[model samples]
Target: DIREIEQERASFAFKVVSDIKDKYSQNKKVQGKYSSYAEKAPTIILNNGLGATLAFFLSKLEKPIDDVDYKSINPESFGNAENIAYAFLYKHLSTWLAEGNGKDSAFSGLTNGEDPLKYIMEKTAIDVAISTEEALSILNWIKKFAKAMLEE
Candidate 1:
């Protein structure tokens, strides 16, 4: 069950990326920008930031009919629910720290000085380990969440 869920999530992410590529390939403006804009085009776009990153990944894609070998992917490589929750928290906190004014941003100081990554991870470490049941529940929740996101 867990293996199936993990593979499905990976497949879903790939599908989303591929769909974006297909849309970009169909756009006249996109084709006008990239001389090599053929479907599954073999080329690389460098250092143009997010747009280029998307295009690069799209260019790396094989034909849509080709199946990605999810079996070779490590199931354990997916982030746990705790890690995902923390990632969301960290992103929001970082944004607030960067944008919030005065007292509301007091916690921002924690990110200062050298080795902020270590400091943050140390502070965020889980003291109490999750039981098997809790882990399974979290995994189920993640599967459901992924399913909802993947739904058109």
Candidate 2:
């Protein structure tokens, strides 16, 4: 009956989306991309699976493409939507998995400056699956806040 961490997740996601919204206050297009990306990120993870999602999101962060199709995010926008989405997910997953959180330290390597992407990528299948579970759960909170507070 104690849903305390759910509240924490919601609170964290609100601030995350709020900060991004305020960051691009002057630009609705970029704001839209961030908001939209949040809406779709969970689906990306669920449909493509976490490993593919992580790899693709990383690639997009490095070299965003021209294609604006549903397959990819808003790369043509002033800022990269893929990066915004990936950054948010990474921030949440890493922070939540730290030594003390509701996630129970699903996997190690959560120390500061450790890249979760590499850790997750190198982990066994079950570890990756658990990460995906946490990601999906966290992404829901993020997606809700982004849609509620951010704009297009």
Top-scoring candidate (TM-score): 2
Q: Judged by lDDT against the true structure, how good is candidate 2?
A: 0.59
User: Tens digits of per-residue lDDT for model 2 on 1-152?
Assistant: 12765766676677767767776677666567666766776788788876576566556564544532222333234345556655544454455544214344323223333344556667787877777776676678877877787775
lDDT at 77, model 1: 27
Candidate 1 wrongly placed segments (more than 4 Å)? 26-152
Quote the positional error of residue 55 for candidate 2 in Å.
2.1
What lDDT score goes with residue 130 in model 2? 71
lDDT string, candidate 1, 1-152, tens digits: 55653454344334433433354444433223222222112122112422232233333333341322221222122234322222222222222222221233322223343222233334433311111122223234333433443222
The worst-scoring run of ten residues by lDDT in candidate 2 lies at: 67-76
Clashing pairs in 2: 32-152
Taken over the whole model, the C-alpha lDDT of each candidate is 0.29, 0.59
TM-score of 2: 0.67
Candidate 1 yields a Cα-based lDDT of 0.29
Q: Say which candidate scores most in lDDT.
A: 2
